[PDB]
Symmetry: D2
Subunit: 509 residues, 4 copies
Amino acid sequence: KPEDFRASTQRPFTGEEYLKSLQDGREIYIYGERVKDVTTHPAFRNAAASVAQLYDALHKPEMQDSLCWNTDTGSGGYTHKFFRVAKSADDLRQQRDAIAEWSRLSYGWMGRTPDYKAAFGCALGANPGFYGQFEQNARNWYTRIQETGLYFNHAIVNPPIDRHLPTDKVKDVYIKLEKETDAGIIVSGAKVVATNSALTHYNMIGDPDFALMFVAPMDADGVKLISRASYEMVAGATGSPYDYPLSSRFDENDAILVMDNVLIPWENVLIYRDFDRCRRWTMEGGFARMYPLQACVRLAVKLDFITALLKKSLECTGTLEFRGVQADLGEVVAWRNTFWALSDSMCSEATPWVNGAYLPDHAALQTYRVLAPMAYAKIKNIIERNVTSGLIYLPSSARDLNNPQIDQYLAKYVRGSNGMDHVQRIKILKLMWDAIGSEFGGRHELYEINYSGSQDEIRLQCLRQAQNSGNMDKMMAMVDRCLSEYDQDGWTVPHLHNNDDINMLDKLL
Amino acid sequence: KPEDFRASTQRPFTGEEYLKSLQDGREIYIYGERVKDVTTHPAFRNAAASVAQLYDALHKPEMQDSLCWNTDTGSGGYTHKFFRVAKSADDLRQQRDAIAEWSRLSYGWMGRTPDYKAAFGCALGANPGFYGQFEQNARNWYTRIQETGLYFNHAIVNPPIDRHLPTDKVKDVYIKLEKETDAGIIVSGAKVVATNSALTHYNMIGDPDFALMFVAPMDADGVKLISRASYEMVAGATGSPYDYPLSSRFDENDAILVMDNVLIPWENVLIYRDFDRCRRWTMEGGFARMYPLQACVRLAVKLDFITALLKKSLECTGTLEFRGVQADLGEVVAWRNTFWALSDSMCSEATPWVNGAYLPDHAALQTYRVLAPMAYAKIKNIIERNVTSGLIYLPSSARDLNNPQIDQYLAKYVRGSNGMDHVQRIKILKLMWDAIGSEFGGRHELYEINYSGSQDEIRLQCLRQAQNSGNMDKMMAMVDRCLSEYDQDGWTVPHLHNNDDINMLDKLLK
Amino acid sequence: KPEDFRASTQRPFTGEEYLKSLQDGREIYIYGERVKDVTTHPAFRNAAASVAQLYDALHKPEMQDSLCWNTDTGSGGYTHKFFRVAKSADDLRQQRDAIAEWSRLSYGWMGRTPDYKAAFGCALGANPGFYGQFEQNARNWYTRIQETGLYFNHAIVNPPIDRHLPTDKVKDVYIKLEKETDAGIIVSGAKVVATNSALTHYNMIGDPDFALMFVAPMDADGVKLISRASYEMVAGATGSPYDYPLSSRFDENDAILVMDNVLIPWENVLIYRDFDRCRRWTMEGGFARMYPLQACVRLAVKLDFITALLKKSLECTGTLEFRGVQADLGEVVAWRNTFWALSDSMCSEATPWVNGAYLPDHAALQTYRVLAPMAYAKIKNIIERNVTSGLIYLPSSARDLNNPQIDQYLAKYVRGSNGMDHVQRIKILKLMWDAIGSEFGGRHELYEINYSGSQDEIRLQCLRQAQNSGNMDKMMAMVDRCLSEYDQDGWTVPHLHNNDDINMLDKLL
Amino acid sequence: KPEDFRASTQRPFTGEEYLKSLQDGREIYIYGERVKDVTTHPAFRNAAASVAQLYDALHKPEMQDSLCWNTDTGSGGYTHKFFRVAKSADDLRQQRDAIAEWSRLSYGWMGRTPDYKAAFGCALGANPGFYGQFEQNARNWYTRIQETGLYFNHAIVNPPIDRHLPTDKVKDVYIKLEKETDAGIIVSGAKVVATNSALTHYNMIGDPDFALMFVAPMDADGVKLISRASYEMVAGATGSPYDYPLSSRFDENDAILVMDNVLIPWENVLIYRDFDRCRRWTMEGGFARMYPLQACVRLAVKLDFITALLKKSLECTGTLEFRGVQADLGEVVAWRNTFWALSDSMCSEATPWVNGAYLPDHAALQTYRVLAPMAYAKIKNIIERNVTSGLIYLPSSARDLNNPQIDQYLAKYVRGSNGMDHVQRIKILKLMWDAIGSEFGGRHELYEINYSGSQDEIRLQCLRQAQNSGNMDKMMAMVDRCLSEYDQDGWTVPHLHNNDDINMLDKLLK
């Protein structure tokens, strides 16, 4: 139904069609109230408009070489390159570049755009046989996501459990099968951290009644979102675009997704009462082996933005001349370079998987995940220790600049160091502040550092990849070879010299 | 005079008297508008009430042992202990404890309360001879600050300069003498980072026309503040106390202070067209040698709060059971302990200064300044890597809890791990979020890491203190002694063995 | 018997008496050979001489005000201040200063000097009633250690266990009671990390047969040490004092202590088949609450040395003029200052304990333990990144300086930046290298970072101290007070303003 | 000529031929004595044997697919792949893999093997026109290095200068032209950090008399090395292979190289009295744009080794079971992965340069240089906090294991946690200790952190590369676009909503 808002079946949504497709009476709450229409609501309307611009870019003739491919479905249509299964390392590189072009439309700040779950679509299309009796659902969902550009999110993090409650009552907390019918399955439960789900068409949701994976439409009866605070709405109500230039347009609301007696049609079921497939899906389904290409590129585009924003901030404060400041900026550049290089390795070392599909280099994926929190924390610390005074006393509002009684003083006392007027100085530094210190900036720090999992778990996943791939045993073979070349009596290889002719310990002792 | 709002001259303001003293038509702007009355304005009214609670505490009988001393002026009155010159190490310890008690009333979140510039009053009273012809102004301001509890701030950071402008035009940016008159001096210019000046009575403001230090009242004609965004107002307009429990009451607005043709009477001048005294004041005036006792204790109280708030957050999420989580919490405890220990050393190693006054240990002050940014950054990182999942999806509003259509789901899906209901879980985690992630939390991170100087400069000040005190030369004497005990021919001291009897190099190489 | 080498019972050993007391046929191995005499052996003779200098300092008239007190035993003698129980905060401060004076005789590099276990002596004398039937042994050992200056070490770390061995055979690994006799107990087993035990008189060694604490003489039959590599001997055999100025005189050999059928007289037993007392000893015995005063001061003296050595190294390389270098040096100063300040707090906040004894502030002890590894790692990193080129190419040997064919080039090409000749430049930088990069320097990095326990365990001990003392509940009371002042309907205290008059959410939504 | 020790001109040295070529009476000092023969001297003989094994690998049939290519000279011979100019991204990838295979023969511990300066040979062969009148010398040296596998090092770091000396006297410290003759130039001066030059055939050495670049043979009269302490000799004299398994065979002595009246024939001169070419050579000559491929791969191979050695050490101590230990190991794996990934990017993003040659990605080179010191420091810290107790008390010597009076106790008390006997436990942990804590280990820490420049300078080089490439301006164009989309009156683009309909500030403040 959502794709029926398109005027053509041979291309994805335009932005205008996407926005119309959201006017479906989805059940969303924020600040204790029901949201009538996400495309007009003060908490969501600009974020929706920002996503709609991504869809518009797909149809600009000058963008289509970098953004789009023909579909592989026989439709005669086209789609964003990352919505179609890659069949070579170069395909992955072209997808890398198409993701980057989309990411640049939000300067790297929207991390859960439609291309993130395009990797889920492609995993379905590349390995549909994984799903057994639901193999045809996988194939059909791949085709649908690819041709239409359907916006998916995933809701996968389980709600907290009160350990002191009876084991009776806590089975109601997790997503669980309630009833099996001929029309599909009825499910109830919740998932937390449903980031930007208010703007999606579908969410993937992932005792055998708990071992499910299925697709849920956002407008299905019983599907509800409970929103977190809206940095977009607060910036609109008490600020301005000048004062909160990122909060006002790129806020991705991290919701709780609730399912209350929701009917999931059988066509939307992918794994059903199946602990074994649920267990193997992360390794074998492909999604976890593919989405970090998007996530790494998106972060790299954000680091492009932050790197130059730091340079511009240091230009206007005048400290960029100093050697130590330039060295700090150079380290930020190195971190920015790192994530582009990891995405290079992802594509260049890609491997054949199944049915001709290629997967990016797996070690590079795990490495991006471990390094990103450290890099982001270090960059934020570099920014704050270099743009010291300049951020703390910024005037409250564009209203200060627009009142000549106040502006007369700002014009004298808050100019930029490099011939820059006060309006441009304050503008640049307010952009940096919205990037790192606003509530939006603080949420993004949380997102970049912890969202991918706990620091232990991401390091364990890195170790497990090295072991499962055989890389660790290959490294161990080198250590074992080294140990084999000597023993407690001396060398065991002929090319090295016995030290008996020079050993002085007998003489000494 | 602001202190004439008191019903008695033998004690500082009560909270109600302090609030009345602020209703003086000071000129403050925020969001393009003039503020009518800071005690009722949506951007300032709770922060003002929060400071007023500090004044109220001074008059509670159960608080006076820890908070108050008699004045040393002969007035028969009393004051907060840090407003009177300390004359022993134990005096400093009592002041340390009185600062701590006041700091606990904002849980460590208000950093520019009146006790901060009480150290400026005491510096004036302890070394008034520093000021030459203005020595009597120093004595009189000490007496006035001490007896009244007048709220001072300092505005000292200079505004930025456009280097491409002519040298004419940019000299108007700094505070400068414009006119010398019989009634005082007329001055214009600006200072940035006038933290909480909207709630103060006076600010200290510090080619000889630029070499000035003087006191300016907040209600003087031509003194103006241009405010930054108000986290208090935003939290009031789009949130609630439950949702922003710190933003809503402890926001200290970091303003730009503008002076436009302000007449400063001669009794308010402390340094006048005097580069030499301006240069020597940081070392010799005493203020810089005394206020870090207040700042270190205030930070330590905040770390008390953050330490236990982290523990409570880990209780809520259930991860406190884990060894690695308990170790992370234990490191936060160690950082918290560090700043209390530094303040112990400040008092125990205090030194006689001038006129019977004592100064806290100088090395401890420099050390606190270097360590605080690293500790705060490390603690914030520990918090985020331990409690993040719990913070990211918190419902928007107390309004969600108060709508049963939503609360029915929150009650089921967001309970605490330890038998705790969802209201208390969400409450604790929203408090942690306001501490570290809200715009208020982000400002406080900037404040703790950056306010005190650049990272280079605070380290240079630490090195210079070690050198100026003679500590570095004493350390160097130990290295020189070590070097003196051998040379290229062997040991030069008799108690160690020549290695000639065991050296094998000739055998190996000849 | 060892103290009978003294010519007087009213003072501790002189250095010469101490050295004679070591010539007792203790059983020590190194490099596969038995050590005849530690005071003349190439691996130990200079370290022994270094310790002997500590004993000599006790008898210099100009040193006795800072180093010595009258004994509290009625002997009419004197002793090092830290060997006598402190009865006030000022006593602890005087002990702090007496420890520092001894530490300066090794420039902070000997960490297991006799004053470390003087705290064990004082714990015995302050709380002898802890030991029940062995209370009189505690009293008698306090008197003996205090009057004589007996050199104790502790051997407490258990050897590793092969988990695949039968539970039979692994009971022989740990120290265990073998036989109870009227002459004492026979024990066998081992302890690792018996640091400098080769130069001690006694070691404290700490199914009920495993729950023991007792004192073992180094010359008891069946007591044996297996030494690690001797940096002293290697520096003597292949270097010189000029080339290894710290290795050659301050090496504290980290031995394995073996007990093979050792008879421990009953007078040497302190805890016997007593799991309860073994468990409570760390909290209640006092030793763990007292020795970190010595350890913190010793580290602070070492940081005094390293701080000025870094400054001197940067003077001779010429980089001290640079702002960033001076800032790095200033951070080293701050770390150095930190440990002196912690020792100040230890003394100033000291508390009455039992029998009039005072204990240093407990939180300060735990804090020193957590901070020291981080500070030492950071300082070493600051040194290496600032004294870059200057360390890597230092000529091999004082023999190079003493051969004019080589010295003619060193004199031209390796001068100091500040008018300093090549001999002094090379000398300073070789001292820095021996401090951080030699095998001795690497061992000291290991010692400062990990010896006090694992990074987790030292942080857990810090948390437990805060909880056990009630500090954590006091901090929690402040958080609870904050939470009590509002609820989901608004403030619960009268002094703050209700936001109902300014709340805009109804209008917005 | 050293290559005349080969039995064939159509391949590089064998190991035995390389060792014979070193028996040339080069002038090397160590411990105050002249070295007679580096291939037999106790300070150099195993390091020489270790390098010789690299040459032997080139001629093993099972190794030649990964190690060797035909020469491009028309000689009909073969060479190590990194000794021939790369003409595509795939060429660089094959070279990357050939470097890795050689690096594995020292487990990543020898960092100045012959393939390091093979990039200098290739730079000469790819851009010989850079050298003007010496272009033909560049071409000829490329041919010679490529066909023979000649072992070059570079000596480029200048000796320290005493600033208190007269300006006369300190100009004799640097390498300088002394005499211009028909047979070549006579030069004197010194360079420090001539790593492993004792085992090389030639060194590149790089007021116009100071602006030189030339090649000097190690056996030229007047060329001398003054060695640092030999970890190989000390390990041989006072240890054993079991006790110091890396020190005993992989020590690369960091010498001072002295030139005293050395005649450099004109065929060995590349830049002569030419400040402009000296200044431009780092950017334009190609060597600096090519050798970091070798250095990054060599480091990655060492991290392969250290990663698994850590795992094996944690197996020995039994702590690998613990979650926090496995996480620490996983971070070491991530750092190891990083440098392999950087080398992937170096090859995949390679660019056409000049004369058909390709250069590796420049940003990746700069990134490797900035990241390597932080990674190595972090890894060493992870190792020490996980395996320290196991390292501190290891028995002194294989002699302890071989004396049954001692071994009886070691067999009981120092077993491995996982059914491993004491000999193997002690062996693994002594290998880890030689890697990180021995004097060799400490030198390698200095080498990985500091050799490449100061921490400031390597970051500045990274920034300059981003600016010079145009990358920074492209990033800045994105920031400028963002700024262009709004102003102080609202949005300037049509797709976003004006907030005038929801802005509440007038209501709040009017």
